[PDB]
Amino acid sequence: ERFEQSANNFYQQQAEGHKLYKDLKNFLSAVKVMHESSKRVSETLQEIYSSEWDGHEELKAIVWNNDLLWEDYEEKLADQAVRTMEIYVAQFSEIKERIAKRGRKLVDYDSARHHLEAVQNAKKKDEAKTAKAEEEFNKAQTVFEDLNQELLEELPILYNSRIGCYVTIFQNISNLRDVFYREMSKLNHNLYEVMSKL
Amino acid sequence: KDERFEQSANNFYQQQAEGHKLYKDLKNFLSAVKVMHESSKRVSETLQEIYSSEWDGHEELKAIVWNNDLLWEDYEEKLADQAVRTMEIYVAQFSEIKERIAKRGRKLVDYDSARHHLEAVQNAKKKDEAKTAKAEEEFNKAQTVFEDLNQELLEELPILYNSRIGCYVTIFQNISNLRDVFYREMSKLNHNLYEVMSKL
């Protein structure tokens, strides 16, 4: 009951992180498509503009700086948004497995329970294998107490981390975009001036 | 003669291939804007879903996402009219031109055959005919028909060739002007977003 709804918490958390991660991944790669299409255009432009015409050199530098700006914007997005999501969502495969192993080690603890009520149900009916049962149950309890006690504190910590990570991620994007726009703005002006000189 | 023509025809073929290509990269560019638009919309919808109406900034976020969407849209409509359809009006002039040049090639074939079939008829091999004013009337007509047309094009092609410069200026100044507002509006929204997320 307490778990099943907490695990329930963790799954909605997983599905949500996974939808976000996917959306970010799509965005990155729309940035690459936007980059690509801008590179093609400035090359056609670089071609249709004669090397004799004034500003042909400044045109060369715009095409170049356009590119270094897309590349840099793309790279930083990949680190600061996509990779950060990947670090974040990796936590979910580890936990899915930790919950798989907690489902087992409690089946063991319960059978080493089942087995020690039927080795000790024997006052003088028991032989040698009596402390071997008590040692077993104790190893099955310590195994499950660690995994469950450590799992019981870890899930909610992880659930509560979700907002901080979304916040870090979206400020990182805004910072990158802020700079990218400002820089692109300068080049946009330079582009107009070069053209105005034909 | 058909050699100022050749250079003018060269020039035109460069211009036409240029316009076709720029036209394509401009259309492609607009696709990619739409792809960005889309991808951003999908990002902001997941963010809206995550963002609780029980939270401060929720309404402002609903406006960011909203205006964000009107910007992309406006920008797309305007790139369409000012860059893509501006090129469409421009490259479209190339149909008439290409059909007039293909037509001027036929008429120079009308010329070249006339020159041949006048020269057999006429040439002192003792079978002259009192009335081949008829090979004269035709092959007079062939040359005046081809020379006029050849002439027309020698006037049109440079006028049109040279106009490529204004088109390119126009189109890139349009885009540049458009980008200027778009970056500035996008910046504001990008800040609001930064602020709206830093309250969480």
Author numbering:
A (entry chain B): 41 to 238
B (entry chain A): 39 to 238
Which sentences did the original study use to describe this structure?
Bin2 (also called BRAP1) is a putative membrane remodelling protein whose function is unknown but high levels of mRNA are found in leucocytes and leukaemic cells. The N-BAR domain of Bin2 is positioned within the BAR domain superfamily of membrane remodelling domains alongside the N-BAR domains of amphiphysins and endophilins. One such association occurs in a subgroup of BAR family members that have an additional N-terminal amphipathic helix which inserts in a shallow manner into the bilayer and induces positive curvature, that is consistent with, and stabilized by the BAR domain architecture. These N-BAR domains exert both intrinsic (amphipathic helix) and extrinsic forces (BAR module) on the membrane to promote changes in membrane curvature. Taken together, these data suggest that Bin2 is a bona fide member of the N-BAR protein family that has an important role in leucocyte morphogenesis.
The structure of the predicted Bin2 BAR was determined by MIRAS using a native crystal and a Se-Met derivative. A dimer was present in the asymmetric unit and the general architecture of the dimer resembled an elongated banana as found for other BAR modules. Each monomer was a coiled-coil, formed by three long, bent helices. Helix 1 comprised amino acids 38 to 88, helix 2 (from 95 to 159) was kinked in two places, at residues Asp119 and Gln131 (labelled as K1 and K2 in Figure 2A), and helix 3 (residues 169 to 238) was disrupted at Pro196 (K3 in Figure 2A). Different conformations for the extended regions of the dimer wings were observed for each monomer in the dimer. Concretely, the region between kinks K2 and K3 (amino acids 131 to 196) showed different conformations in each monomer and this was likely due to crystallographic contacts. The movement can be described as a lateral displacement of helices 2 and 3. This does not affect the curvature defined by the concave face of the dimer, which would be consistent with a scaffolding mechanism for membrane binding, where a defined membrane binding interface is needed. The overall fold of hBin2 BAR was very similar to that of Amph BAR consistent with the high sequence homology with dAmph and hAmph2 (N-BAR sequence identity of 37% and 62%, respectively). The concave face can accommodate a circle of diameter 170 Å, which was slightly smaller than that of Amph due to the way the protomers intersected and the distinct helix kinking. The dimerization interface of hBin2 was smaller than those of dAmph or hAmph2.
